[PDB]
Design a protein around this ligand. Structure first.
Ligand SMILES: O=C(O)CCC(=O)C(=O)O
Ligand code: NI
Ligand code: NI
Lengths: 299, 308
């Protein structure tokens, strides 16, 4: 239960030249985000944001179904056991902003919530060219989000309400039972070691974003976010690598850099060759392979 | 773990070939009619009937031969003379030290083109020995003389062929490791860095600890079956003469035609490594924080789609 460092009065420069390079999670207390942290009450937020349709999600596994609703009702229901309901009386809601055409364009609080945007100052921790996306994350009290990872550097700004989040090192990948970018273990707290023995060797870092706190999540770091109370956050993705290194298709910040994806493909070719020797020689030379990859491309 | 390699007597060409062989495990066979070699081949006889065919030889100043440091030097001798020296302890004449040890491993006339064959190169001697007929004729790949000074310790290597190591004279301690144990052995090519296997430097080679070793000793008359890929480490305990017979377990097509020894890995496997070295080249131009993550993705993938 390692804790992630909290730090006050950290500077633009201090961050970029001395903290950022450490490549480790870190929360930043007392940054100036503007008025937003002060005036984004459920009652204000509904008014300002508007009634544009936002794609909704309704401990989550598919035990959730997607819906849609007017932004203003999304928030108001997020706060509320909601009276009117898509599925249940004790429904829980969850927003994750997306562009107009989700497969074409990234989310961006500027373009999509202009009026609300003017209320928040994103930390100037990266260069304006490196920007990737800005995302509203509004969830209801208690919601539990599977443990995923993102390929962009991330700033998770907690604007309103509390929120627990626990993180894992990229190197605790093996113990994570990775189905793509998500991990199989839903309940982080008391995990059925029965079903997944390895999840226990994973060193977890924990921390709790209080309204106004900023959590930095380096590229590749694993993280579970549980909304202690109701609240709205925004996180900001940005390109750590030269812009050419990433996936063009990717408007979520989830697809590996092409390089990873390319070498992962030729890897499947090497295996298609190997596969034609009797299992026993195939086994042998596969292990001889991972031996190689470890000596040379590890740390 | 320290296991024993089974020792079976009166095993027949059919049992071995049908029952024992497909098990793919080490096995020693006792009491096989090896021909008269086993009683005839004294050092005096071998010098004589073996002749003066000049042979390439390993000379070493220390029992524990080493490829990392390469603490031994290639030389040549007339066969008879090699035998004669291998059987002494001290030496009148010598390449390096009065106490130096010798190792013969029979080679073809032109190693670049010719596999070694006891038949072709020591015609008179092949007369005294009846190779166990335990494989199909067509798959016979090679047959090698092995002659060593007492107390000489070769290194842990594996071979790509199946192999019958025939212990004609002297006594040989042989410990083997599974091919799955590759991860514990600190290999560099078909060789292992761990030289001292009885008193291993665990400070230097920690993983060597997880390695489960089969052990067995070879006495005159004993024949040992060493399936391909099985690591093995031999130590002639007193001066002895072995011969060994490699042969193809796979479609002859699968092997590397340029290989006259039995080391070079099946072309396909070799292929996959040139391919893989390509992936490891493209990925390599990602920052290491990243590349490292995708390496570990890669091995996770191999242990699933490609391991046993
Ligand atoms: O007998 C020896 O000295 C070594 C034999 C060996 O390594 C083999 O037959 O593969
Ligand atoms: Ni995320
Ligand atoms: Ni060998």
């Amino acid at each position: 239960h390692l804790p992630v460092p909290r730090l006050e009065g950290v500077s633009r420069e201090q961050f970029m030249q001395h903290l950022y390079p450490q490549r480790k999670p870190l929360v930043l207390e007392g940054i100036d985000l503007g008025p937003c942290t002060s005036k984004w009450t459920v009652d204000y937020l509904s008014q300002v944001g508007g009634k544009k349709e936002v794609k909704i999600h309704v401990q989550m596994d598919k035990n959730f179904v997607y819906r849609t609703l007017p932004f203003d009702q999304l928030v108001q229901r997020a706060a509320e056991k909601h009276k009117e309901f898509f599925v249940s009386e004790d429904e829980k809601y969850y927003l994750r902003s997306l562009g107009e055409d989700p497969r074409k364009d990234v989310a961006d609080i500027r373009k999509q919530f202009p009026l609300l945007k003017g209320d928040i100052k994103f930390p100037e921790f990266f260069k304006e060219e490196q920007f990737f996306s800005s995302v509203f994350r509004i969830s209801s009290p208690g919601l539990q989000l599977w443990t995923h990872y993102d390929v962009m550097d991330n700033l998770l700004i907690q604007v309103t309400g509390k929120k627990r989040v626990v993180l894992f090192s990229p190197r605790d990948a093996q113990y994570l039972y990775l189905k793509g970018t998500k991990s199989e273990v839903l309940n982080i707290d008391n995990p059925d070691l029965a079903k997944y023995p390895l999840f226990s060797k994973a060193r977890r870092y924990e921390c709790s974003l209080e309204a106004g706190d900023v959590l930095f999540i380096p590229a590749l770091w694993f993280h579970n976010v549980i909304s202690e109370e109701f609240g709205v956050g925004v996180n900001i993705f940005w390109k750590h690598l030269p812009s050419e290194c990433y996936d063009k298709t990717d408007t979520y910040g989830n697809k590996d850099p092409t390089a990873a994806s390319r070498a992962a493909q030729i890897l499947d070719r090497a295996l298609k060759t190997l596969a034609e020797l009797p299992e026993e020689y195939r086994d042998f030379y596969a292990r001889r392979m991972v031996l190689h990859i470890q000596d040379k491309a590890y740390s």
